[PDB]
């Protein structure tokens, strides 16, 4: 069979902060995406280039599973051509995105009484991210006319902020776990394929 390790990214006990989003590379395997659709009860499962019924009969060079955690009302930003703190300074998606965005409510696991301060995001950036860029620098952000010289203070800000997830929030402010599947189709051989392409070999 040599099936693909989705349970290693969708059921990981711990997920990454959005600014340091994690990325697993799925390759040399077969994948049943209709199983993944009905695998759980996902709050969000939106596919842009394609659809999951059609995905079971396609072949791609590699697949990438980017994973992280954000506020519910930030999941709208995990889409092509969006703007916001998250889509511009943490996780950017190409306009020509062929892939699926999947997200589910993770309140029981990631919010804590008084706040979970281990989840973070980038709050300040001179420029927008390029699509699929990752930025983990912690250089002080100059918000004024006076340079900062690496010293934090007035108009000189540490660029990361804690989410502080609490259960007493409304859903919009609750932590959601997100997995972005992106299907690259380079000129190299397809390492990942769907199951419907075994009929051509029997």
């Amino acid at each position, epitope marked *: 069979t040599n099936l693909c390790p989705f349970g290693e990214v969708f059921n990981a006990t711990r997920f990454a902060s959005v600014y340091a989003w994690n990325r697993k590379r799925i390759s040399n395997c077969v994948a049943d995406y209709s199983v993944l659709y009905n695998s759980a009860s996902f709050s969000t499962f939106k596919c842009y280039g394609v659809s999951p019924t059609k995905l079971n009969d396609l072949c791609f060079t590699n697949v990438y599973a980017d994973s992280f955690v954000i506020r519910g009302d930030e999941v709208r930003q995990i889409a092509p051509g969006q703007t916001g703190k998250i889509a511009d300074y943490n996780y950017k998606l190409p306009d020509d995105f062929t892939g699926c965005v999947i997200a589910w409510n993770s309140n*029981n*696991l990631d919010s*804590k*009484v*008084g*706040g979970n301060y281990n989840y973070l995001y980038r709050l300040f950036r001179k420029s927008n991210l390029k699509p699929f860029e990752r930025d983990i620098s912690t250089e002080i952000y100059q918000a004024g006319s006076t340079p900062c010289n690496g010293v934090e203070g007035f108009n000189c800000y540490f660029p990361l902020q804690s989410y502080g997830f609490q*259960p*007493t929030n409304g859903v919009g402010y609750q932590p959601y776990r997100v997995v972005v599947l992106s299907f690259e189709l380079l000129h190299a051989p397809a390492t990942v394929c769907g199951p419907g392409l075994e009929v051509l070999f029997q």
Partner: antibody
Amino acid sequence: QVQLVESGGGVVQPGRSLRLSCAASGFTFSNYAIHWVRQAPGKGLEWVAVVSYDGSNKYYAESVKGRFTISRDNSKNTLSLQMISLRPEDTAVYYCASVADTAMVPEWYFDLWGQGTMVTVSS
Amino acid sequence: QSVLTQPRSVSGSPGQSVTISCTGTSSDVGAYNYVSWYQQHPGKAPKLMIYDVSARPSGVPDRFSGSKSGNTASLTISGLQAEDEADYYCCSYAGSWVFGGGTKLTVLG
């Protein structure tokens, strides 16, 4: 065997001070929030106070604010409740309560309980 | 302050079912679904029987079931057995953890 053990109960006179302790074993104490919940003899439950996993965020119930102080040592895996100006209305069994690592229950529910310790405020 | 309102007593014949109500405000039981139900036998600590309104912790029989509607949660015990005779307490975690007055469930013998 995840286990919480309370200690430091006894009889105090109205107006004096006592300090209860709750020691933890079997799980990752430093990872979850833990609460004090009390029950006066023959009556119902009353939530008293909670401390976050981080040890700085602490919340109490109005009936108790100003008099009880909650704290936790995440290196010794203990927590303490310092009570002062004790009234007779505080006479009760004090349980400490949290959740365990295996449990899928969040920390805002009282899944794991101690055996309690009795505090009797009587002149 | 506030206390969620449970019936003082409930009686149920063995093998049959019973339902303990637990009525609160829109700022308590209605605010969030953080409703829980605890069982307490004489002289021992409470045990969590229901959370997230309808959820059963590991090792709690499916005879215990939890529901909510408006400002009122309801614990339901089917297939009543003598061991179920006990005090039951609901709890709502909205602004603070608020308990109910308790309900003494007698299994009629």
